[PDB]
Amino acid sequence: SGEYPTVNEIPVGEVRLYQIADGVWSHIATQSFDGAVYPSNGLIVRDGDELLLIDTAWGAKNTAALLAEIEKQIGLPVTRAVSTHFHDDRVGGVDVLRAAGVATYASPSTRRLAEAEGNEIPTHSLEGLSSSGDAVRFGPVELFYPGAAHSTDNLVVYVPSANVLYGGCAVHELSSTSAGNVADADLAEWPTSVERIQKHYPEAEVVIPGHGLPGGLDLLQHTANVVKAHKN
Ligand SMILES: C[C@H](NC(=O)c1ccc(CN)cc1)c1cccc2c(-c3ccc(CN4CCOCC4)nc3)c(C(=O)O)[nH]c12
Numbered sequence: 001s002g003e004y005p006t007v008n009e010i011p012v013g014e015v016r017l018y019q020i021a022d023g024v025w026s027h028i029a030t031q032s033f034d035g036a037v038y039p040s041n042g043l044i045v046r047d048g049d050e051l052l053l054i055d056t057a058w059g060a061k062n063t064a065a066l067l068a069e070i071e072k073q074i075g076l077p078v079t080r081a082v083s084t085h086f087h088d089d090r091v092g093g094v095d096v097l098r099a100a101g102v103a104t105y106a107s108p109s110t111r112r113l114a115e116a117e118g119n120e121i122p123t124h125s126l127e128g129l130s131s132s133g134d135a136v137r138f139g140p141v142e143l144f145y146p147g148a149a150h151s152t153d154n155l156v157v158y159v160p161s162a163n164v165l166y167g168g169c170a171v172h173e174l175s176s177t178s179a180g181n182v183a184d185a186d187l188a189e190w191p192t193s194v195e196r197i198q199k200h201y202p203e204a205e206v207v208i209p210g211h212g213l214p215g216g217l218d219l220l221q222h223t224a225n226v227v228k229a230h231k232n
C-alpha cells in the first residue's frame with residue numbers, strides 16, 4: 001500500500017515495483033538460497049518509449065514474473081538489460097530475458113566470472129569499465145565502476161535526470177549490521193570504492209541498495225562503516 005515492500009511481504013515468485021522518481025522504478029523480488037529467504041532489488045529506467053532494466057529478479061521464474069509485472073504496471077517494452085555483477089541475484093534470469101527479446105549486457109569481467117561460476121551469461125560486453133573510476137553512458141543512465149567491493153566486478157548505476165544512485169550490492173541498507181554475503185568481496189578495498197562513489201555522485205538524492213530499503217546518501221557512509229567493522 002505504498003511503503004517499500006519487505007521480504008516477508010513478497011512470496012517467492014511474485015515481483016513488485018516501486019516508483020522512485022519520474023521514469024525510475026525499483027523492482028523487488030524474493031528468493032531462497034541455502035535455506036533462507038532474501039529480498040533483492042533491481043532498477044527500471046524509462047528510455048523514451050522503451051525501458052532499460054538493471055539486474056534480473058533473481059531466478060528464471062522471478063524474472064518472467066518481473067516482465068509480466070512491468071507489462072501490467074508500465075506497459076512499455078524492456079529492450080536492454082545490464083547486470084551489475086555476476087551473482088545469481090543479478091544474472092539469474094538472463095536466459096529468460098534473452099528469449100523475451102531483451103538484449104543483455106555486462107562487463108567482460110562479469111561475463112567471465114558468471115561463466116566460470118556456472119551462472120547465466122549476458123550476451124554483450126560493456127567495454128570502458130575496467131579501471132576504477134571509469135564511467136560510460138548507456139541509454140538514460142551512467143554506468144560506473146567504483147573498484148572492488150562486494151565483488152571485483154560490481155558496477156553502480158546513476159540516473160542523471162533524477163539524481164538516483166543505484167548502488168547494487170556494493171551498497172547496503174541502513175538497517176544492515178553485517179556486510180551480507182562477502183565470499184567474493186574485497187573488505188580492504190570496499191571503503192575506498194565507496195569513497196569513489198561518494199566523490200563521483202555528490203548530488204545523489206536517492207540511494208538504492210542491492211537488497212533492502214532505499215534512502216539517501218547516508219547509505220554510502222553506513223556501508224563503509226559496516227564493512228570496516230566487519231573486517232575488524
Ligand atoms: C545470490 C548471492 N550469492 C552470493 O552472494 C554467492 C553465492 C555462492 C558463492 C560460492 N561461490 C558465493 C557468493 C546471495 C545469496 C544469498 C544471500 C545474499 C546476500 C545477502 C544480503 C543481505 C543479507 C543480510 N540479511 C541477512 C538475513 O537477516 C537480515 C539481513 N545477507 C545476505 C547478498 C549480498 O550481500 O549482496 N547476496 C546474496
Ligand SMILES: [Zn+2]
Nearest residue numbers: 085087150169
Ligand atoms: Zn553478489
Ligand SMILES: [Zn+2]
Nearest residue numbers: 089169210211
Ligand atoms: Zn546481492
